[PDB]
Each structure stands twice: as structure tokens, then as C-alpha cells.
Design a binder for this molecule. Structure first.
Ligand code: SRM
Ligand code: SF4
Ligand SMILES: [Mg+2]
Ligand SMILES: [Mg+2]
Length: 564
């Protein structure tokens, strides 16, 4: 027994048909087969859910940018495309990519080929494939940060579709201007029966993966990447002099779940083991292959790797992976405590240049903010990078540029961290309505008024305005803003209501739990005021809301809410 998507992939000639014929039909949309295929090419057909009556079809596009790195030429091309063919905005994402919403079917090939001819790609941004690979977004020249970044690039390249469908459709097969040889040799290796050596996809095969697959790379300590949520987390381990020697690996995280279906759940990734640095790409493929061959393909709700690991347990999974790796994992090595880093504000690269992280609420770049960011990036010929908290880092800045860049940013309303509510600095919301077809309610368009209401509750209770909690909001339980790691998570569960989740911590090292269902938007103060009063009244010195939640436990918190 096999899902509808499996058959679509099977009969597509490696992601070509009938997408190829649908792209040139006169209709404003494309058929269901083509709807599923185009995801693999980094585009999503959407309809605007605000405009009553009619189906206004449009296409969202998502880029592929390992480590969040965006060359100058790409940023300029994307900025112009958003205005010419989109709806005037770029959307920075929780996986360090751009989305561009609103593109009409007839302009889609113009847009994607422009991306392609300007040092970018959308290949594999969606689909049953490896998604954008995360890495530390800060452009530090420190050796282990550079090594984390190189590794994410290499992993992304390894797991890039090889069929040629992408260039066939978007640029009529022409050639666009080299991967390290370690990548090529790893991809080619079949000493342990990992590959399909005669297939146009030696790793993916005809069927690709059972579902999206997510990888995050970082250096010890830096949890900007929210590593525990990914299919694979990879951590650089270095000797005492800061020279990288290998990687710790984690497996089997995921956020996605469905309301009222308790066999679906978020899950933290398990520590799997350590490998020496030369082995990383072999170990990554082994893991991918184990999911390829064993993840469920009958029911897509249960297809992500977190489920096979939940069913088999981590030891049986390890053993299976070790058959494709051809050797044993070493013991996972100790790591320091995780820390969240925003990379915001003025900092040093380590090579004489500065970087500046720009706070962007929800990653939505538009209006004057967009115009000013483009002027700066273009005038100073800056490369940039996207952070997993939907923010933008301006790289490679000369000391003499710091003042005029600062002045321009401030003039457009783009404030430095010290002038932003600390709630906003760590908050995230998904796009949800109006273009998300799975949204049950608002997230991006509701979060800002929610934050002000939280700050007003703090004020009322007597909490200082420099105190904060991590607030994440989604419009549905898919978890695109990783709400299940929040200190205070709001997960859409009706048209005007949120399920509230507590128990995440400031460094994203813990999984939250479901605290109350169907809290109506108007009622959130009834829940938040007692919680925050009790935190303020009985927290230990400097104890975060999340740690306090986990120490106190849900029975006592519910009692406090119920007696309010
Ligand atoms: C833009 C972005 C959210 C954001 O505010 O930044 C996003 C937006 C959507 N995600 Fe997501 N997801 C984004 C990262 C995530 C993450 C976070 C992460 O990867 O760290 C998760 C949770 C981790 C996980 O995958 O478990 C997430 C879990 C989902 C799911 C649930 C997946 C599952 O296996 O259960 C879906 C729906 C699906 O795949 O069926 C989904 C599907 C969607 C769709 C494409 C809706 C759809 O299927 O048509 C989104 C479009 C909204 C729009 O109108 O633009 N998205 N999605 C995400 C940043 C993504 C990127 O690749 O560049
Ligand atoms: S979490 Fe739900 S509502 Fe939000 S973007 Fe993802 S799918 Fe859409
Ligand atoms: Mg997909
Ligand atoms: Mg942000």
C-alpha cells in the first residue's frame, strides 16, 4: 500500500511530467500531479484566503541557501523580483532561506530562471528531499565556525537531486556556472550498498525520500540552529587548540503533529554517536539511506524519521545505520551547555571587518525597511546571511561604514537590539493566513499585538521591562515556527483560538508540553496573568520562565490558573 504522492513521483520521469506540460497550459493553476511535483522545484501553488469568492492562484517560491549565506548578486535579484513579480515582500525563514509570495503562473519561469542566473537556486526547497541545511549564520572567521559552514554546504551538495529535471524545465537545459572532490567521492561511494548506481538519482532513486528531511550543523555551544528539532543534528568537535577533529551526531527530531491525533507528536533528536571528520558525509548518507529504505510510504503522517526511531528505539536504528556506514559510531562525546545566539547588533568577524545583525519581526521585509536594506546592500556590495530566527545579517562591513549604515537603518525603523522589546527579539511566527493552505488561524498577522499584550501583563504584574520569555506562534500544529520548543508557545487550534504550550527553555534544550487547549484570543490574559504572577512571586533568582515551569510542574500551574 502506497500514498498518492509515491505514484506521482514514480510516473514523473524524475520530477518532470506532467509538470512540464502543465507549466504551459493556459489555465492559472496546474493539476494535482503538477502541484505535488513543483514543490520539488521549490515552488508552492497557493490561493489567497482573504479574498472572498474566487480562487486567486499564485505561486510562492523558496530558495536554497546552505548556512543562510546569500551572495550580493542574489539578494539584488530577489529584491527586484519581489517588486516586479511578487507582492513587494521577501520573507526570511526559520531555515535561513527566502520565500517570495504572490507570483502568477505565467511569470514563474521568468522568475526561477532569474534566480538561477543570479547565483541562486530553489531546487529541493520543498519536496520529499533534503531541505535547507542550517549552520551558524554569523560570518566569523574562527576555524570551527567556518568548518561547520563548509560541512553544511557539503551536506546540501551531497543531497542535491542529480536528475537534471530542474535545469530542463527552468532554463531549457542550458549550463550555468565546482563541488569539493570529497563530496563527489562520497556521493559516488557504493561500498556498502547505499546507492542506485545506474539511476539518474544514485541516492534518492525513483521514489526520493518518504518525506522532507532536515539537517542542522553547528559548533559546540551555539544552538542558534535549534538542533534538537532536526532529522539530523551535527556538531563540530575540536581539540584544545580549536582544530576540528570530528562530529557528534543527533537523530530523529521533528515538530509536526495533528490536533486530536495522539500518535502524532513533536520529538527531540537523540544523541547517536561521534565520527571522525573525514567520515561525516558517509555517516550522513548512511542515515539518509536508512530513512529512504525504511520510513513509511503508506501514510504520510507517520513517514518522518522520528517515527522509525520511536518505533525501533535508538540502538536498533544505530545498528541499521552502521550497516550502510560500514563501521561503528564512536561514543557520543560530552558537549558544553547549549546557548541561543541571535547574532544581532554590531559585532566583529575576526578579519578586521564588522557584521551587523538586523532584527526583523517574522522575517517580513517590505516597505521602507526593504528599500533601505537594498540601498545599503547594493551601495556597499555586501553579502548577507539569513538566521534561523528570521533575521538578516549584513556581512563584510568596514569600520568607516558603521555610522552611515546605522543612521540609514534607524531612519527606516530598523532598530538595534537595545531599542527593541526583548519579547520581539526572541519571538517567531509562521506566515499562516492568508496564503498558507493549512492555517487554522493567524500567526504572523496576530503575533505583534500578542507581544504588546504580554508586555502589558508583565507591567501589570510588576515584572521589569528588561525581562522576557521566548514566544513562538503557529497558525496550525505543523510547527513551522518551532513552537514546541518555546517558553510560551501558541499553536492555532481553531479559527480564533490557540493551544498553549509551556516548558521550552531559553537555549531550546527542552521540549514543551501541551498546557491548555482552545484558549480564545480574547482570554489569553486570564491564563497569562496568573502564570506570570506566580513566576514573578516564587521564581528563584534569575530563573527563566521555562525552567520555572519545568520545576513547578503542570498540576501546580493549572491550580494557579484555576484559582485566579
Ligand atoms: C516559511 C516557513 C515558516 C517560517 O515562518 O519561516 C514554513 C512555511 C510552511 N511550511 Fe513549514 N515552514 C518552515 C519551516 C518549518 C519547520 C522548522 C524547521 O524546519 O526548523 C517545521 C518543523 C520541523 C519539522 O519539519 O518537523 C515545519 C513544519 C511543516 C509541516 C509539518 C511537517 C511534518 O512532517 O509533520 C508542514 C506540512 C507538511 O509537510 O505536510 C509544513 C508546510 C509549510 C507550508 C509550505 C504549507 C504547505 O504545505 O503548503 C508553509 C507555507 C506558508 C506560506 O504561506 O509561506 N511545514 N516547517 C518555514 C521556514 C522554512 C524553509 O525551508 O526555508
Ligand atoms: S505552521 Fe501551519 S499555519 Fe504555520 S505556516 Fe506552517 S503549515 Fe502554515
Ligand atoms: Mg514537500
Ligand atoms: Mg526575528
Amino acid at each position: 500500500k502506497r500514498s498518492k504522492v509515491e505514484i506521482i513521483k514514480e510516473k514523473s520521469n524524475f520530477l518532470r511530467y506532467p509538470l512540464n506540460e502543465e507549466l504551459v497550459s493556459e489555465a492559472p493553476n496546474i493539476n494535482e500531479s503538477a502541484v505535488q511535483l513543483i514543490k520539488f522545484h521549490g515552488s508552492y501553488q497557493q490561493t489567497d484566503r482573504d479574498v472572498r469568492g474566487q480562487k486567486n492562484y499564485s505561486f510562492m517560491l523558496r530558495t536554497k541557501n546552505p548556512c543562510g549565506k546569500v551572495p550580493n548578486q542574489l539578494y539584488l535579484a530577489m529584491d527586484t523580483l519581489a517588486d516586479e513579480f511578487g507582492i513587494g515582500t521577501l520573507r526570511l525563514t526559520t531555515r535561513q532561506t527566502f520565500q517570495l509570495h504572490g507570483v502568477l503562473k505565467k511569470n514563474l519561469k521568468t522568475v526561477l530562471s532569474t534566480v538561477i542566473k543570479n547565483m541562486g537556486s530553489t531546487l529541493g526547497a520543498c519536496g520529499d528531499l533534503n531541505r535547507n541545511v542550517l549552520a551558524p549564520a554569523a560570518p566569523y572567521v574562527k576555524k570551527d565556525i567556518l568548518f561547520a559552514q563548509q560541512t553544511a554546504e557539503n551536506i546540501a551538495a551531497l543531497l542535491t537531486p542529480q536528475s537534471g529535471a530542474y535545469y530542463d524545465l527552468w532554463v531549457d537545459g542550458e549550463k550555468i556556472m565546482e563541488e569539493p572532490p570529497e563530496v563527489t567521492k562520497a556521493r559516488n561511494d557504493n561500498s556498502h550498498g547505499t546507492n542506485f548506481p545506474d539511476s539518474p538519482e544514485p541516492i534518492y532513486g525513483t521514489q526520493y525520500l518518504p518525506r522532507k528531511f532536515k539537517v542542522a550543523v553547528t559548533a559546540a555551544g551555539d544552538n542558534s540552529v535549534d538542533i534538537l528539532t532536526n532529522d539530523i543534528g551535527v556538531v563540530v568537535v575540536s581539540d584544545d587548540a580549536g582544530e576540528p577533529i570530528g562530529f557528534n551526531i543527533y537523530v530523529g527530531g521533528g515538530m509536526g503533529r495533528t490536533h486530536r491525533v495522539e500518535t502524532t507528536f513533536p520529538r527531540l533528536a537523540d544523541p547517536l554517536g561521534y565520527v571522525p571528520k573525514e567520515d561525516i558525509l558517509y555517516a550522513i548518507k548512511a542515515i539518509v539511506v536508512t530513512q529512504r529504505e525504511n520510513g513509511r510510504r503508506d501514510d504520510r503522517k507517520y513517514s518522518r524519521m522520528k517515527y522509525m526511531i520511536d518505533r525501533w528505539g535508538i540502538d536498533r536504528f544505530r545498528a541499521e545505520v552502521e550497516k550502510y556506514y560500514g563501521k561503528k559510531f564512536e561514543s557520543f562525546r560530552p558537549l558544553p551547555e547549549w546557548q541561543f545566539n541571535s547574532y544581532l547588533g554590531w559585532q566583529e568577524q575576526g578579519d578586521g571587518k564588522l557584521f551587523y545583525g538586523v532584527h526583523v519581526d517574522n522575517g517580513r521585509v517590505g516597505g521602507q525597511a526593504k528599500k533601505t536594506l537594498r540601498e545599503i546592500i547594493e551601495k556597499y556590495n555586501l553579502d548577507v546571511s539569513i538566521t534561523p530566527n528570521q533575521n538578516l545579517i549584513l556581512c563584510g562591513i568596514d569600520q568607516a561604514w558603521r555610522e552611515p549604515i546605522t543612521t540609514a537603518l534607524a531612519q527606516a525603523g530598523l532598530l538595534e537590539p537595545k531599542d527593541v522589546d526583548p519579547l520581539n527579539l526572541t519571538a517567531m511566527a509562521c506566515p499562516a493566513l492568508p496564503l498558507c493552505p493549512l492555517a487554522q488561524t493567524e500567526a504572523e498577522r496576530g503575533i505583534l499585538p500578542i507581544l504588546k499584550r504580554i508586555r502589558a501583563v508583565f507591567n501589570k504584574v510588576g515584572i521589569k521591562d528588561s525581562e522576557s520569555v521566548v514566544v513562538r506562534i503557529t497558525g496550525c500544529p505543523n510547527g513551522c515556527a518551532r513552537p514546541y520548543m518555546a517558553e510560551l508557545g501558541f499553536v492555532g487550534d481553531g479559527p480564533k483560538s490557540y493551544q498553549i504550550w509551556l516548558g521550552g527553555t531559553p537555549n531550546q534544550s527542552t521540549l514543551a508540553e501541551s498546557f491548555m487547549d482552545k484558549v480564545k484570543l480574547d482570554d489569553i490574559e486570564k491564563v497569562l496573568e496568573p502564570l506570570f504572577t506566580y513566576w514573578n512571586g516564587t521564581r528563584q533568582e534569575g530563573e527563566s520562565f521555562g525552567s520555572f515551569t519545568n520545576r513547578t510542574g503542570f498540576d501546580k500551574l493549572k491550580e494557579v490558573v484555576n484559582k485566579w
